């Protein structure tokens, strides 16, 4: 029958910023998970509930794939149990997470000489994200007790700090593209197999 459009998710030309991570629903298809592993062009490949071998031998009700961009300093946080700028205020994975986390260095595609100022994370937030919650607010945050009147100024900062992607950057401050595969099981029949 059908193939899973995992090639559309990974090899897509546009990725989103972390705060507005793009999630896509993969269903009614069959994809090769051994073949994803047999890349060896991914710098990070960690799976959390599942074996990357036993994935071709499985079926799930829904497969979810979230795609964003972070820096390398931050890649260690796309994991259960992680606390951080990203792990708290941008994109958080629960502690029962079964899935894979895949990320590679996209400095050739995702940075510019003048500054690629188009990817952003949420530096400032009142509380931590719930797992898999999305915050798209652009309210002007408040750090000190003086209010903000919706404009930026000292101790009233804009919540979204642009990554300053230049290629000359060091490894940690280079863009890493990321895709998280979560695998759901519910009473509904299986739709993504091997």
């Amino acid at each position, epitope marked *: 029958t059908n193939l899973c459009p995992f090639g559309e998710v990974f090899n897509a030309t546009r990725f989103a910023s972390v705060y507005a991570w793009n999630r896509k629903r993969i269903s009614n298809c069959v994809a090769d998970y051994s073949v994803l592993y047999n890349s060896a062009s991914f710098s990070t490949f960690k799976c959390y509930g599942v074996s990357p071998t036993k994935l071709n031998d499985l079926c799930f009700t829904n497969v979810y794939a979230d795609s964003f961009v972070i820096r390398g300093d931050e890649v260690r946080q796309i994991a259960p149990g992680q606390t951080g700028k990203i792990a708290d205020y941008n994109y958080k994975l629960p502690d029962d997470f079964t899935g894979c986390v895949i990320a590679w260095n996209s400095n050739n595609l995702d940075s510019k000489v*003048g*500054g690629n*100022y188009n990817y*952003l994370y949420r530096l400032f937030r009142k509380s931590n994200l719930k797992p898999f919650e999305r915050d798209i607010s652009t309210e002007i945050y408040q750090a000190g*007790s*003086t209010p*903000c*009147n919706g*404009v*930026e*100024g*000292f*101790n*009233c*900062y*804009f919540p*979204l*700090q*642009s*990554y*300053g992607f*230049q290629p*000359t*950057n060091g490894v940690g401050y280079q863009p890493y593209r990321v895709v998280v595969l979560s695998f759901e099981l519910l009473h509904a029949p299986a739709t993504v197999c091997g």
Partner: antibody, heavy 119, light 108 residues
Framework: QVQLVESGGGLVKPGGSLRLSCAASGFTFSDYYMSWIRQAPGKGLEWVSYISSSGSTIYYADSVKGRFTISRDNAKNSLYLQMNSLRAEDTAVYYC????????????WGQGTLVTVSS | DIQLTQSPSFLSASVGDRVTITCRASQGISSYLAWYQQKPGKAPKLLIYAASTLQSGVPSRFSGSGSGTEFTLTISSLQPEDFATYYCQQLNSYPLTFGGGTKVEIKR
């Protein structure tokens, strides 16, 4: 030695354009907001525009909105102002200035440049 | 668009006199203010910031005070080399607004 060296400036045939450049040394420039403030001959300080520490955010005065384009490069620590459709009134000395880090509310200014818009 | 109202426009004093300048903000700005001293045609220089705290290298005679609406700059013993125009700057909300500016004369 915190210092903002400004450069460019000078006599612009009205209607033309000029670029203004601000070479930053002495601090972690990528931490600080930045601003372009001009001062007509023997008149007040007019703030004109700013750019967030990340370049995420940007606003312009109504006196220059749409007309001027502010920018920052954060590897070369400079801050740039592209001034288009210059007027008689736009004649001023132009100053760049660090406004504040997330943590040190400590301004500092550059030496200025005489943008002199006439024919 | 916080307006700054600074007095006097022009003060004249003799050496060793105590010049006192007031800047009042059109809304609460709770210590987000700096004080500069601008000799003619020269860059403004920082003297006080955070309403009260004295920049390194600024003679101790200069001093700031205030929080909210009323702010003062004080030269406890004026000097022949303080002839300038003195501005306050509001940092609470952009656009950054400045005070009128106070010229200072030395009487001899």
């Amino acid at each position: 030695q915190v210092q903002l060296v400004e450069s460019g400036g000078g006599l612009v045939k009205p209607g033309g354009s000029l670029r203004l450049s601000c070479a930053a040394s002495g601090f972690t420039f990528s931490d600080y907001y930045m601003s372009w403030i001009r001062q007509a001959p023997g008149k007040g300080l007019e703030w004109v525009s700013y750019i967030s520490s990340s370049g995420s955010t940007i606003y312009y005065a109504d006196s220059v909105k749409g007309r001027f384009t502010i920018s920052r490069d954060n590897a070369k620590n400079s801050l740039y102002l592209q001034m288009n459709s210059l007027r008689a009134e736009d004649t001023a000395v132009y100053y760049c200035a660090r406004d504040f880090s997330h943590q040190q509310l400590v301004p500092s200014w550059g030496q200025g440049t005489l943008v002199t818009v006439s024919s | 668009d916080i307006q700054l109202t600074q007095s006097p426009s022009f003060l004249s004093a003799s050496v060793g006199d105590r010049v006192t300048i007031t800047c009042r903000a059109s809304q609460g700005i709770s210590s987000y203010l700096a004080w500069y001293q601008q000799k003619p045609g020269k860059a403004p220089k920082l003297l006080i910031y955070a309403a009260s705290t004295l920049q390194s290298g600024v003679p101790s005679r200069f001093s700031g005070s205030g929080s909210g609406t009323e702010f003062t700059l004080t030269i406890s013993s004026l000097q022949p080399e303080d002839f300038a125009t003195y501005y306050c700057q509001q940092l609470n909300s952009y656009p950054l607004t400045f005070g009128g500016g106070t010229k200072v004369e030395i009487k001899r």
